[PDB]
Amino acid sequence: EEVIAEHPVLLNRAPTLHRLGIQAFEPMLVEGKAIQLHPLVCEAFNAD
Amino acid sequence: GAMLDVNFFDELRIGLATAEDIRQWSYGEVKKPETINYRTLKPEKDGLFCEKIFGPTRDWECYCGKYKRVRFKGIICERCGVEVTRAKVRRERMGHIE
């Protein structure tokens, strides 16, 4: 947890149609096996 | 220019190649359609994998076996004719068919 602090990570989805398909977030640990995504960017990625 | 490589790139220049250049690139002549001998599982001689043309298959190890130590470097084998060097040279040397 002390290593990843303030260490950006790139998230991408395919197809990457337009410029906003690749975005850099800050990672935080969660429980399980699924990447958690912010709901306000689903339109940019076009991800359901 | 720049021979092998490393960042002095300033221009790529393509062009037709003549027979003389083709015979310049090659380190030997392939004249036998044998890939590898099954029993020895080692390259044939004068074939499509000959070590004398394209280089040794193992790091600092000649085909005959007269040399297997690093200190021996650059000595063209006096018996088998394979140059003692690193195996990566098999990714660079080219042959030519006459």
Binding site: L37 | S26, L48
Partner: protein, 147 residues
């Protein structure tokens, strides 16, 4: 005349000579770029380039023998035709006539197929590459993270 002038001017301006069109020697790609894979059980799968080079070498040896041993012009001419076809298949398989097929009636990947389409070393191994420090997963929604 205008459509022709392009190539004549191109060969006129530069010091290069047209004799490069007709080959006298055929280069051979380094082995590591056409490796054979010895899958378990002696299943040595060979890259198509190996088979095409094998054909060319066989025909060249046969023609050399026939010339040295002495033969009528007709047989030598036919052997030269076969050599010409073998080289044509080596450089661009399927451009003229029936493709040289191998196991199970399939075409063989000559050299020119390594630099073409979405399988060549121009748009599948130079513009986009697999990378380290990476992963993938299924995404879910969390209305607790900030933006």
């Amino acid at each position: 005349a205008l459509k022709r002038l392009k190539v004549v001017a191109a060969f006129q301006q530069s010091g290069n000579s047209p004799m490069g069109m007709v080959l006298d020697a055929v280069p051979v790609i380094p082995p590591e770029l056409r490796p054979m894979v010895q899958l378990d059980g002696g299943r040595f799968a060979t890259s198509d380039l190996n088979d095409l080079y094998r054909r060319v070498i066989n025909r060249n040896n046969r023609l050399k023998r026939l010339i040295d041993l002495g033969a009528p012009e007709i047989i030598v001419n036919n052997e030269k035709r076969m050599l010409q076809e073998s080289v044509d298949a080596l450089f661009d398989n399927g451009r003229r006539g029936r493709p040289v097929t191998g196991p199970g009636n399939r075409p063989l990947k000559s050299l020119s197929d390594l630099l073409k389409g979405k399988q060549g070393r121009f748009r599948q191994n130079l513009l986009g590459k697999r990378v380290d420090y990476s992963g993938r997963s299924v995404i879910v929604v969390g209305p607790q993270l900030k933006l």
